[model samples]
Target: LGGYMLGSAMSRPIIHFGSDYEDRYYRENMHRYPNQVYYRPMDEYSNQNNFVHDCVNITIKQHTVTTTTKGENFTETDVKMMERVVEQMCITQYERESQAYYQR
Candidate 1:
């Protein structure tokens, strides 16, 4: 009975994403148990980096202002909305940094 159970458990599949880093972390390392996966912890470092990158990326993308619809142009409302979006992005970054504000 023990031999049958061992054979069933050891025949499990390995999860690999075809990346060197992930292969090392998940497959090469024996820190994980059967059917267990390690997820990257999203901490302050990730939040800060994402906040910076998201602001720049969204702002840059909003520059090419041409609506692909008929009777569509970058009007004052559109421009204001774009500005407000970027402003909110910055505000969200601030909120992330502030523990009290974020808790709200």
Candidate 2:
């Protein structure tokens, strides 16, 4: 993506993909690479053999819809709605569901 002229950011639950480094840009007029804070291991998770597209959860196109749920495109925004359902449905379902018995 070419990104925005004013520059922007993307947020989803624990992650915040920041563009336009505020500190350096404001203080020294320096450019900093976009920061993917609390970034999910999407690459690793995507490479999994068990990964399912629309069957278990969402698809690549669904990302936009997911963002919409956060008011990015306006479709019932919420904190929890920002969570990536595809990750949990296809790959992380086992681990996420297992949280119930984490102490065990």
Candidate 3:
């Protein structure tokens, strides 16, 4: 019964921070001794979770897409295209983060 060996490999996602100090600290010590690191817990009310919620609320209208976050009105066909591109980007990030939650 010991003849068969099955090994399953799993990979985990790494956290990144926008701050230089946090990024440098993680990079310097990630491979060394374990150190306390700050990360947002994944839950229904977590920031990443809420980000997906916001992404879903994005509405695309005819010839224009409106968002309350930033106000800059410019009329162009490519602006509509850019809105779609940003929508897809948000969806992709949401998918990646959502998968990470399940992997836990």
What TM-score, over all chains together, does every model reach?
A: 0.26, 0.22, 0.32
lDDT by residue (55-78, candidate 2, tens digit) is 222233344555667876423222
lDDT of 3 at 41: 31
Which model is ahead, 1 or 3, in terms of TM-score? 3
User: Per-residue alpha-carbon lDDT of model 1 for 38-101, expressed as tens digits?
Assistant: 1122333345445444443344233432243343455443333334334444444445445654
Put the candidates in TM-score order, highest first.
Answer: 3, 1, 2
What TM-score, to 2 decimals, does candidate 3 have? 0.32
| Candidate 3 per-residue lDDT over residues 10-94, each given as its tens digit | 2212345566765555456445221121122343345554553343333223113333235545344334333433344444555
Taking every candidate in turn, the Cα RMSD to the unseen true structure, in Å, is: 23.4, 13.8, 18.6
- Itemize residue pairs with steric clashes in candidate 2: none
Instruction: Select the stronger candidate by lDDT from 1 and 3.
Output: 3
Candidate 1 positional error at 65, Å: 4.2
**Model 3 spans > 4 angstroms off:** 1-53, 56-72
The lowest-lDDT stretch of 10 consecutive residues in candidate 1 is 1-10
